[model samples]
Each structure stands twice: as C-alpha cells, then as structure tokens.
Target chain A: RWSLKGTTALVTGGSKGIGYAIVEELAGLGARVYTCSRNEKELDECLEIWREKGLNVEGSVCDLLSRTERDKLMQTVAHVFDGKLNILVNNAGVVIHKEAKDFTEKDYNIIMGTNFEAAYHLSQIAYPLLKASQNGNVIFLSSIAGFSALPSVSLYSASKGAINQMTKSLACEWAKDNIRVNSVAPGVILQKEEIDNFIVKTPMGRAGKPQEVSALIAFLCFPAASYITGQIIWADGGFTANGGF
Target chain B: RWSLKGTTALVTGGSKGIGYAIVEELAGLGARVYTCSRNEKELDECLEIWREKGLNVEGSVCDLLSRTERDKLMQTVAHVFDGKLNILVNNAGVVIHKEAKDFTEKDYNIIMGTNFEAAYHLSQIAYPLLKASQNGNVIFLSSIAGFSALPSVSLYSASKGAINQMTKSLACEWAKDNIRVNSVAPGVILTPLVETAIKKNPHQKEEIDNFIVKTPMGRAGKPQEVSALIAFLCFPAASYITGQIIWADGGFTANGGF
Candidate 1:
C-alpha cells in the first residue's frame, strides 16, 4: 500500500471538491494533513467528520486571497507541524466562466490572485520547511483548460497555464533539494448528477470521480513516485488527450 | 504570419522529437504537409544546414524498404496528390541499443517496419505533389533523450512529446478538412537496433538506466506497442479525437520518479 507515514501535508481549499478528496486520501495514507478553507463553519464541520473517522486531519479558516490571512495560516501550520512540511498541494483555485473580452479586470485579478499568486507565495513561504524535510513534494491542482482553451474559462485557463509552467520551473529549481514538484490536470471530475454535456468529448467515454483524481495525487505524495518531477499528469481519462476535438 | 497560405507540408518522426518543430509550426502557420521517413540521411543533411542558418524547410527521397514498396509508394501518392504534393519530410527511425539476449522477431519487424515502411511509402509517393504546392513544410526530429535516457530512440519526454501535443492543438486550431494532422509519442521500447545505436555512443547507458528504474512497469515495451493506438486514432471511432498525443509507454508519465 502507498504510504506517507510521518509526512506532514498541507492542502489548500481542502473543505470540498477535489481538495476534500485529497485531504481524505493523504490523511488516510497516514500523513498528518492540514487543510484550509474560507468558511470557518464548513472547516469545523469537515474537521468533525474527519476526527470521527479517526484520521489525523486538521483545518483552519484563511481566505487565500488575503496575504495577511495567508501569513497567519502559515504561522499556525509552522507551529502545528513543528516547522517541517513534507507535502504542499496547491489546490486552492477559482474558475471565472466568461468570455475573455467581457471579463472585467476585477474578474481576472481575482482568478489570478487565488489560483496563481497564492500558490506562488505559499510555496515561497513554505520553502524552508519543505527544504528541512529533504523529501519534499509540491503538487499544483491545474486543469485540462490549461492544456487547451475552454470556451468560457479563459482566465481560469491562463492561471492553470501559469501553474503548469510554475510546476516545471519549481521542480527544476528544487530538485537539488529533493523537493519534487508536479501538477495534476484533472478533467470534469464529479458525481454522475454533476456530469455536463462535455463528457462526450473525452475518449474514456465518462467523467472521472473525485476519488480517481485523489488516488493519483495520493500516489504522487508517496515514495513510489520518486523519479517523477516536473510533469503534468492528466487524470482526465483522455479528456485533454482528445485535444478538445 | 502563421498562415500557410496554399502551402503543402510533410512530417517524418513528427510523432516525436525535433521533427515536430517543423511539422507543428508549419501546419500551425497554414501549411499542408505530407511526411514519412525510412532513410534519414538526406533529411539530416538538409536539416544540418537549415539548423545552422536557422531556416525552416522540408524535403524528401525514395528508398524502398521492401518488395511491397511499388504498391505503397510512387503510384499511391501520385494518385492522391495528382502530381502536385507540396511538402515532404522523411523522419524514419530505428533503435538498436540493448542486450542481444533481449532481441526478438517482433522487435525486428515492428521497429524496422515502423522505421522504414511507412516512410518510404508516404514520402516517395507524396513527393511530386508535395513539391507542387506553393508553401511546403516538412520535418523529422526529437530531443527528449537529452532530458532522460532509455533503451532506444523511443519518443518520450522530448520535443516529440511536446510537438505531439502541440500538433493536436494545431489540428484543432485549423479545424479544416483540407488540413490533416497526427503524431506519435512512444514510451520506452527497448530493441537490438536501439542498443547498437547507444553502444556506438557508450556514454548513454546511465541515462537509459535512469529511465528503466523510474519506469513503473520495471520493463521495456515492445516497439509495435504504439502502433495500435496510432491506428485507433485513424479509425472512425476517433472522428472527434483529433489533436491528441497518445502515450503507449507503460505508465511512464503516470509514475512520479520518487
């Protein structure tokens, strides 16, 4: 079984969706997982469920857009993990669905700030702690939109595009420190009820489950993925593979 | 500037490697290209000068790999292009750089057939028509081996890989019936021909070892392993699966090199 025992992981936006699934996977794999969400009550609710399940999961409330809050969250994590962090899943992101020509500057900035800027700052701030771990890892939750333009999500695509390159650049820069950086670009992962018409575009002929994406993320955090660095693995079951045809 | 106008094109080894640079860029810019390569001597000679001058160009030659060549080449492209094919780039390939103990009939046929057959058939037949076009584009190359090494000249983690994906993007961008697009990105497939090529260099072993260990399957794939996938893309079922670079490698990209 894949294991991340003794590893300390921080997954941003872990209260729901893909982030929630990642929290469950990492914590279940024996990693000390700390997650964040903007909703305090939601964080508490999720924390209760995790605690009842007996997984070592923790939660905090921090709006990723605010630097002040992010700093505060970092400090808390530093104290909680005793200043050592092994994995950081930069999963906190927002998708602004609108035509590029119609999007206001505010729309662009918010998406960029939350998706790209926040991850950049968090990684920089957590650099020391990751370096201390030696076997450090960082995963960016990117999207298939980054691989090919999705009609109405241009800004979201751009941020993911930036994240994709950031993954490569950081992986190269930090490989010497034994910190492996990568990204998982998922495609239309959701429940059956949430499936949209886009499912027909994928070659796998179906939408993926949150657990499917989480499984790949969980594997990346383990020792088995040692040689993999600077890659954007598409867990979209051939969504991007179809090249948006 | 990206418009090919009425240009014709060809891409050999366009499935992977530096050859993709010529294929995708040309196709993206509005060039109609046709490509296949079994003998790469002329392509290297042409590209050597092109690379030096930083020029973008494509060319062709005829070297039949088998007796079945007559039915596959010359007449075929002649019939297709009506003596007006525009682009021809020969990007044929083979790998002979593994232990002899691991050689097999499948490797010889698959590698040789893949490296030789399609190239000779496509290029020889397509040349006249390719040269007849107004703007012609052709290329055959890849450099992923520089990043990591494996048993042979497989297509992965290199320009070919990028081009494979990029070509798909271009295909989608073109979205015109007149424009045809495709690519191949092979994972790690070891063979005797590939081994011999590497042994000639000798220094490439460590990098090859690096790939072998990192590959989750802990074994090399057969050379023909990627062919069916390529064929699938050509099938009617793949009508909408354009602009894709498929990997036949045994979970290479999926495995994080931990």
Candidate 2:
C-alpha cells in the first residue's frame, strides 16, 4: 500500500543486477522511473522487458564514468521530469576482484570512478530537483563489503566505504533540504553457485534475491521512512552480523 | 579542542577495559567524572590512578546485576551532579565465551542483565536529569559483536543488538528532548589481557594475525582510538549525528564481501 505515484525517480546502472531490480520495483509502485547504463544494447533489452510488463520505465545509454555523460544524463532526467525529481538511487557500482597489492591506478579509477564518483556527481547534479520536490529520497547501493573486510576486493570495499560515509555526511548536510540519504548494504545477491560459496559464512543459509534488496529500497523511498535518515541498513541476512566465523 | 568543561558524566563499569579508557578521556577533557564497578578494590585502584594524575574523578562499588544497587548508584550520581547530568556513558558490559547450544538460562540472565538491562534501566532512571540539562548526550559502548555474530558469544551479540536498536529507537523518541543518542562498535582492540592471551596461544596469535591482515589498516586498533571517538561524540562536532552505529573497527564490517 506504499505508493510513490506522481513521483519521479532515476536509478543509475539500472541495466542489470540489483540496479535492474530497483528500477522494476519503483516503476511497479507507480513512479515515473528513469534508468541508465553504459551499454545501449543492454539498456534497450532491459527497456523491452519492462515495457512488456507494462511498467512505467524508460532508459538511456549514459556511461557513468564520464563526467559529460553524467551531466547529460542529469539534464535529460531534468527535462523528462520537468525539473523536479523525487527519488535518486545512486546504485551503479563495479568491483575488480584483485588483491590490494595487485591493484593499479587504472583499477582504482575504474572502480572508484564508476562506483563512488558517479554517485557523488549525479547526486550533486540532481540536488536542485530533489530539493524542489520537498519530499526527496536518495539511496546509494552500498555492499556488505563496505562494512566488512573480504579478501580480493579491497578497492570495491574502499569505494563502498566512501559511499557509506557520504550517505551519512549528506544526510546531515541536507536534513534541512528534506532529502533523506541512506544506503543499502546487501550480502550475496548472485545466483546459486555464488550462494553456495558463502552459504557456510552467511547466517541466513542462503543468498538474497534482487527483489529482497529492492523491497527495502522501496520502503526507504516511501513516506513511511521519513524519519529514518543517515542509516546504512544491512539486508545481508546476518552475513556481517557475526564475528569469528 | 572538543572540551567537555563543566559537563558531568557517569561511566558504568569504569574500573578497567574500554569503560576505564572512556572515563580517562572525559576527565582529561575537564569533565567531572564519576564511575562505578562491582569490585570495591578495583574501584579504589582506578580512583587512585586518577587521584595521582590530579584529575576530577570519583567512583563507588555498585554491582550492575542488582536493580537496587543500580538505582542507588543513579540516585547518588544525580545528587552529586546537582540533579543535572550532561552525559551518560552506558559502557558497562559482560561477554561470555560459550557456544549458543551450550548457553544456560543463568548465562542469559547474567549477560543480559549486565550488558543490556543495566543500560536500559539506568537510562530510564537518568531521563529526568538528562532532560533537565538543555544539552544532553547519552552514548552506549556497543561492540562490533553487536553488529555481527561471532561464535561462542551469541548471548553477548544478542544483548548488543538490543542496545543498537534501543539507541536508534531512543534517538527517534527523544529528539524532542534535545538529547542525542548514539552507539560505538569497536573491533578487536589490543588490550593487555588479549596481548597476553595471544602471546601464550599460537592458534590465537595466528587467528589474530589473520584478523589484522584482513583489516584495511592491517593493525588492531588502540583503546585510545575508541576513546577518541567516544569523546568526539560528546562534543558539538557530532551535533547533527544521531541514530547511527559508528563502527571504529578498521573497516572490519565494511570488508565482508560476497
């Protein structure tokens, strides 16, 4: 019964995975949803799927790594939503499975630029529209990696840490603007194979579906979560809940 | 400088460990400090340490396991601070190292009593005095164990989870009172006892090494680091922060990847 009708939302990196799921949930809840990805083909395919379901969803090909593309994407969204944006989910993120010592500057740039910088720049660009809406919601797709240390993904963990801190800092800075900022730290949202690998580690005994993460995101965007800000709610199925595992 | 001048604080279980560090930090910052512990000898020893340093510190022996003792301690603190308490640090806690299946009802009562119930009852007792002071701050000494489950400490973890949720719930409920509530979750801090244990046990040493390596900082955090964060939360610098579980675990929680 939580409705976001007449609201405008833009979910970055919405071509696949958690991003795609968030776009679907928002659109299903009656929001005018816009999403973007770097691949035009993937974007079109996702759009085709959403259209088939009669969801109010649209998309474009905007490589979040590029500042120009990020600006243009924001401009396009501003135009589409008539200069008022209600929700912005900065969920585009990439991880390079490399050891900390094995990382190069390129890996840092690629991962940090795509995951942290894209969200930062996009949120800034969408500020005026969000502020105008008077009931604004901003969410970042953080990972359980951001809160816990795992081997082989040090750079990914670092980027998500920045996202988590930024979520808090912005929530403090923008409370007066009526923009509630928060992040979702998910556990393993992959398939059966990946779930099997972490099953012994995850206390919940399984991996979370995309819909599970999307449902929490939907609630955070709803008016029900009006008082909840500056929180990094973990939907990691107690994966990060235990020590000495 | 983040001074706590003119502030009166009560740190429970301040005879040693993290609670002791918090008391030292606050007293060093010019806050009038009062602390309590169950051991009369240990309380006297900690008081002597502060007295030698010329700090404004005081204490008594009050076991947190007893409701009557907890109420007496809170009443005494209220009287000492002239019925106005500026900061209350709920830092008293006990952890039992037993597997979940092996835990007894007595284990539940003791851990839950000292760790969560004591803080809850004390906070409720001090609410009037805290509300009297226009600038009130309440901090809970939560552990990383609260946020994550570790083997052999399921009861400890459950109590901390309750504290973490209570922190958020109270923050929401008491914003009207101008009181800010927050919790700090610390990782594997290098205590003297832990250092000694690691030295005697090669397995513990290896496990600790693995934990250190996995930590982004590649080192166990000092108790001073935790104390500094606690002191920071008491200052105006953290004025806008509330309902947050700030983890000072060298990114331990942030590094759990899929």
Candidate 3:
C-alpha cells in the first residue's frame, strides 16, 4: 500500500546485492528509476532481470570511487531525467574485512570514499533536484556495525558511524526543506557472494534477504512515510536485537 | 505479574518524583528496597507515604551526585540488608530547561554529571555486589528526548543519549556476568510538576490531553505506567531481553514526532 507512483528515484551501486534489489522494488512500485554501478556487464544482466519482471529501470556504468565520474553521473542523471529527481538512495559502498594494523591508507580511502564521500556528494548534488519535488526522500544504507563494534572491520564500522551521525545532523538541518533524510542500518544482509559468510554468524542461521531489507527501504521512500525522518532504524532480523554472538 | 518477593533493590533519588514512584512499585511487588535522596525530610515523607500504604520501605539521605556518598550508601545497603544487592536502579538525574544558544558549559556538565556520570559510576561500584547474586538487573531511567530532539532540552537530550548508548555497550560487556542492563524511556509524564505547568497554559490541555490533536493514547501517562514496564524488564519474563532501550512512552516514539 505504500506507493511511489509518478516519482523519480536514483539508486547508486545498483548493479548487485541490496542495491539491485532496492532498484527493482522502487521500479515495481511505479517510480521511474536510474541506477549506477561499476560493472556494465553485471548492470546489464540486472537490467535484464528487472525488465523480465516488467519494472521500469534504466542504468549506466559508474564506479563510485572516481570523483570525476561520480560528478558526471550526477549531472547526467539530472539532464536525462528531466530534473525530476524526487528520491536518492545512496546505497553503493564497499567494506574491507581486515584488522586495523593490516588496513592500508588505500583501504581507508576506498572504504571512506565509497561509504561516506559518495553519500555526501550525491546528497549534496541531489539537494536541488530533491528540494524541487513536493515530497523528497533520501536514504543512506548503513549497518548495525554503526552502533555496535565488531572486530576485524573497524574501518568499515567507523565509516558507517560517521554516516549515522551525519544522518542525524542533516535531518536537523534539512527538516524545513520537506526532504526527509534517514538511513537504514540493516543486519548482515546475505546478498550475492556474502550469503554463506553471513549465514554462519547469523543467529537465525541465515543472512537477511535483500528483499526483506528492500521492503523496509521501500516503505521509508514511499509517500506515506513523510512523517519519519532523522532515524537510523535497524532491520537486522533479531541480530542486533540480541547482542552480537 | 512480575513479583519480586525476595529481591533486594536499590533506587537512587528515591524521595520524590519518578524515583519514589519506582520504589513504591517495587515494594508493592514484595521486594525489600533501599532508597536514597538528598532531602531527609522528603525521604522520610516518601517512606511514610509508602509504609502507610502497607509497603516495606527503608531510606537514607545522600547526595547521589557525590561518589563518596553513593559508595557509602551502597555499602550501608549491603551491610544492613542481608549483605546482598539484587537490582540497582540508577534513577537520579537533574535537567535545566533553556534554549540551545542560551545554554552554557556548566549546564552541560551538570546534566551529564547527574544523568550520565552518576549512573556510570554507580554501575561500576555495584557490579561486584550485583554479580555476587545469580541474577542482577540494572535499569537506567531515560527520556524520549534521548532519541528525539526537543527544542529547549538539548543538554538533557544529549546526556540521556549517552545513557542509552551506554546501556547497549555495557549490556554487551556484562551479559556474561549474568547482569542485565537496560533503560526505560518515558514520554511526558503527568506528574504534579507537569500538571501545574499544564493547568496554567490553558489551551495546553487541548494540546496534550485532547486525543484528536495529539497523543494517540488520549492521556498523559501516570507514573505507574512507566514503573510497570520497568518492573517487567527487571523481572524474569524478559530474561531473554537485554541490551535494549525499551520505550514505555505510550506510542510516542513509534508515532511520528508531531
């Protein structure tokens, strides 16, 4: 019943995993969608899957790590989409599974850039377009790691913690804009290659399906969610609900 | 249904307002209680009020803001009452109402000291006594402002936010100790202080009490509503529930901040 018909949405990192599922869900709910990811081939394959399911999705190859390419992609989305961007889901991000001592500056930049900078830049660039619409939504994909400290991924957790605080500060700043800003701190989502890795640690004996997270994400973006903002709600399927095992 | 017949409980700031209500609730459930508040006169009145109502209650006068007094109070409770502490409720805290720009560093420190520091120090001091028993419960009283930002109470909000996060972090660290840490966040409680303010505001009755305008529950919560949920979390039914910031706020947090 939560619908987004006649709106325009842009999903970053939409080639696979939770990002791809979010794109499909928004499209299924009747929003015109534009998606971006690094792999043209993989992106095309995902497009085929959505098309087969009769969802309206158009996408392009975009490596979110490159600043120049990210800027150009934002410009292209603005121009090609007739400047009607109502929702922006900053979902494209990468994580490194390593200890702090072994983490390189390269790892630092990549993780921070993908998780924080990309979201910051896209939200900054999309502000005008989003503000132009009647009811605009901006969603940032985060994790329970933002709230709880887990070993071996200190840098990833740090980046998400920054995102969590930013979601709070921005929601305070942008409330008058009528643009609802919030983030989803999902439990370990088992999408694509990460399924087996997450299932072993999950108390439920499985990672959260992309569709499960996508369902909540879609609800946040729908027009009915106009009242909710500045929250980092966790849909970790009783994972964070129970302290880390 | 959450009975505490043999439990020995500690309640801070137990003379008046929210703290006294908690003591009344625990004693009604049949727990032996030790309570602390700064004012001896008010503390004695509170004990008499509950004892006259047929509840077992005892008290001591100590400034919960003073760590020395807090330690001495806990030692007295341990030494006086069977030398075992089952539950410690860190409920004493102070708040000053001021606009954001008008607030000062002193306000911040004072709020954090009572709301956060006292709670933290008491938890550390009470850990051994709490862990000595097989089942230990630590309940930190928080407010909806901890999660939702209100216009004039930024310091109170931030300090309680610290308490909420501390609840989670400590629960994870101490769960293996058989000690459960949790917080109960209450919405606008209709206490005597709030009632006096609401009555003077005239149209405000229509604002908070008028169900058509605000509050899906139609009335501001009595102090007992909060105590009931706090009692539930401390009792056995919620043994599996830990590290959670449960809101007993009358659907306030679940509803959009209107």
Candidate 1 wrongly placed segments (more than 4 Å): A191-195, A243-245, B1-258
Candidate 1 chain A TM is 0.96
lDDT of each: 0.63, 0.81, 0.77
Q: Write down the worst ten-residue block by lDDT for model 2 chain A.
A: A190-199
Task: Report the C-alpha lDDT of model 2 over A1-245, residue by residue, as the tens digit.
Answer: 37888889999888889998999999999899999888889899989999999999878898888888888999999998999999999988887875443565577568767876677768877888999999999999988776655656655765675566567656766778999999999998863454475667888887789999999999999998889998999898888887757
- lDDT tens digits by residue: candidate 3, B1-258: 367988889989887777878998988888889898878888888888888998888988988767688779878988866567888899888766654334554664577567866787677777778888768899998886666665445556756765765676667667888989899988778665456545776554454454323456655677888888878887887898887888776677777756
Task: Please name the candidate that would achieve the greatest lDDT relative to the true structure.
Answer: 2
Q: What's the lDDT for residue B158 in model 2? A: 52
Query: How close is chain B to the truth by TM-score, in each candidate?
Result: 0.46, 0.92, 0.90
The candidates' DockQ values read 0.02, 0.01, 0.04
Candidate 1 local lDDT, A117-216, one digit each (tens)? 6787788788888999988999999888767745566556656655665576567667888999899999987723324656888888887888898899
- Please name the candidate that would achieve the greatest DockQ relative to the true structure: 3
- What's each prediction's clash count? 50, 18, 0
Question: Which ranges in model 3 have alpha carbons more than 4 Å from their true place?
Answer: A1-146, A149-245, B192-213
Q: Estimate each model's TM-score.
A: 0.51, 0.51, 0.56
TM-score winner:
3
